[PDB]
Amino acid sequence: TKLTQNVDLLGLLNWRSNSQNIKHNLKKLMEVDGGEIVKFLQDTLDALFNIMMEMSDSETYDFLVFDALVFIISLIGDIKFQHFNPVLETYIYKHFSATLAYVKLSKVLNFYVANADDSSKTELLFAALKALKYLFRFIIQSRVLYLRFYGQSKDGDEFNNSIRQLFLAFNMLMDRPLEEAVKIKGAALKYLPSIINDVKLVFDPVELSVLFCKFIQSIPDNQLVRQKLNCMTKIVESTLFRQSECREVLLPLLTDQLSGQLDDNSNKPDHEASSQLLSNILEVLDRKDVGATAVHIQLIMERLLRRINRTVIGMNRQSPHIGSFVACMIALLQQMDDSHYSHYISTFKTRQDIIDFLMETFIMFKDLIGKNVYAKDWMVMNMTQNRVFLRAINQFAEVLTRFFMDQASFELQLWNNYFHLAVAFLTHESLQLETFSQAKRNKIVKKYGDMRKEIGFRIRDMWYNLGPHKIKFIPSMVGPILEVTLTPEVELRKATIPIFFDMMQCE
Numbered sequence: 001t002k003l004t005q006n007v008d009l010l011g012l013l014n015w016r017s018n019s020q021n022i023k024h025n026l027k028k029l030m031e032v033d034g035g036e037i038v039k040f041l042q043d044t045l046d047a048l049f050n051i052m053m054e055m056s057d058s059e060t061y062d063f064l065v066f067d068a069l070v071f072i073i074s075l076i077g078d079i080k081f082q083h084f085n086p087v088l089e090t091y092i093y094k095h096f097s098a099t100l101a102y103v104k105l106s107k108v109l110n111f112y113v114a115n116a117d118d119s120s121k122t123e124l125l126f127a128a129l130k131a132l133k134y135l136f137r138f139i140i141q142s143r144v145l146y147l148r149f150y151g152q153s154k155d156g157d158e159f160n161n162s163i164r165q166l167f168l169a170f171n172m173l174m175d176r177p178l179e180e181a182v183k184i185k186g187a188a189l190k191y192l193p194s195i196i197n198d199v200k201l202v203f204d205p206v207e208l209s210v211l212f213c214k215f216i217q218s219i220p221d222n223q224l225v226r227q228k229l230n231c232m233t234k235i236v237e238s239t240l241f242r243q244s245e246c247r248e249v250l251l252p253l254l255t256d257q258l259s260g261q262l263d264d265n266s267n268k269p270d271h272e273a274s275s276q277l278l279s280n281i282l283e284v285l286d287r288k289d290v291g292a293t294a295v296h297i298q299l300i301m302e303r304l305l306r307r308i309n310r311t312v313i314g315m316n317r318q319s320p321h322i323g324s325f326v327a328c329m330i331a332l333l334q335q336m337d338d339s340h341y342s343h344y345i346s347t348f349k350t351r352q353d354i355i356d357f358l359m360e361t362f363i364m365f366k367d368l369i370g371k372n373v374y375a376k377d378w379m380v381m382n383m384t385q386n387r388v389f390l391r392a393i394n395q396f397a398e399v400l401t402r403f404f405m406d407q408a409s410f411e412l413q414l415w416n417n418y419f420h421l422a423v424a425f426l427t428h429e430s431l432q433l434e435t436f437s438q439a440k441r442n443k444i445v446k447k448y449g450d451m452r453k454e455i456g457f458r459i460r461d462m463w464y465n466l467g468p469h470k471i472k473f474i475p476s477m478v479g480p481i482l483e484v485t486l487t488p489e490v491e492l493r494k495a496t497i498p499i500f501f502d503m504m505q506c507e
Contacts, residue, residue, distance in 0.1 A: 386448075
């Protein structure tokens with residue numbers, strides 16, 4: 001476990017006397033075995049730093065050493081080599097002693113990205129794309145080491161610049177024709193968001209946000225849809241916990257790309273990745289102490305609901321992962337508050353437009369409750385979505401009231417649809433269902449109450465409020481009110497039968 005079989009390594013150990021073959025040894029490093037390396041890799045790192053504080057004037061050696069360490073870390077990525085990382089970070093954060101190397105390293109990266117069209121530099125590029133996370137971690141450590149060693153950076157600004165220009169070269173690669181490096185472009189988008197949680201330390205988070213923003217617009221906007229979605233997933237994942245000052249600026253970009261995903265009619269395959277976004281975004285929104293988001297959920301509401309309803313009427317087919325999108329929209333309006341329904345979801349364009357939107361939503365709810373997308377074993381989340389339907393459909397009852405009694409002296413037909421939903425929802429989850437156990441009864445009751453009670457009371461009181469237009473309704477609507485009157489409970493049945501006498505007197 002100490003004995004080593006290699007000449008390149010050993011000569012580099014006394015590179016101080018092998019000051020000549022440093023170039024040669026470096027040219028010979030690409031075939032040094034991983035086992036040969038791992039024994040004293042950190043020691044190679046220290047010798048490497050000695051080289052870089054001394055012989056930086058051989059920026060040829062900067063390239064060579066750079067690719068050598070990239071080869072080292074790419075080696076380290078393997079399952080055979082996942083295990084040294086504790087030693088790695090220990091050295092990086094206890095014995096790493098490089099101060100200005102990070103400048104040189106970012107510099108070499110910028111060279112490589114600049115010289116990207118060269119096929120000989122392509123693989124060095126792509127390997128660096130793989131190792132970006134460690135590369136940046138080391139550049140962080142070297143930079144902050146320079147910082148403490150010098151107290152502060154008189155020129156940290158030009159460092160931030162280094163970041164920006166390097167980003168710009170990246171941007172123009174994405175502007176460059178795809179056929180050059182389509183693979184490495186995907187690899188880029190994949191591995192860049194690694195660096196951001198380390199960018200946190202030494203940077204303006206808003207600037208990083210807008211950086212990746214510009215990056216995203218730089219995409220050829222008919223390519224790498226799955227790839228870009230996974231990338232932006234890794235973005236939304238991290239540093240969105242540092243919410244307010246990246247949320248607000250990333251978010252519009254996020255909506256742009258997902259709404260491009262919305263309706264192009266090539267949209268069909270990305271469904272999965274769109275679902276991941278939709279999910280992660282709003283669930284971290286519900287992640288409590290990330291910050292205040294009611295406005296933010298408000299925005300997402302505004303410009304994604306009619307969208308997603310259309311979507312899942314198109315995602316309609318039961319066989320696919322439609323249910324995931326269901327989870328999305330429910331959780332949405334679950335978190336999202338009544339106020340926000342009132343905000344603009346109440347406040348759409350010319351009235352008949354919102355009327356059409358509502359009728360679509362209702363016939364969707366009918367498509368949901370009838371033919372639930374669930375195997376009846378997820379009754380937990382099933383009951384929950386019952387709750388959110390309860391709440392949302394309530395709020396829709398109130399909007400239809402506040403805008404659609406005889407103040408709108410007319411336009412009273414849609415309520416047939418309405419009450420169909422009202423009952424069809426009411427038309428399951430009955431006494432025998434809880435009867436599966438007493439535990440089943442009481443679990444449902446304690447956790448949830450008896451939703452049927454207030455469902456009935458809502459239909460009841462809105463029936464009262466329906467006004468003398470009831471005459472337009474009775475003979476048709478008499479169907480459903482028997483289901484509710486037949487409801488196996490006691491109370492709401494007592495509150496429900498009088499409806500008979502009510503339209504009895506109206507007629």
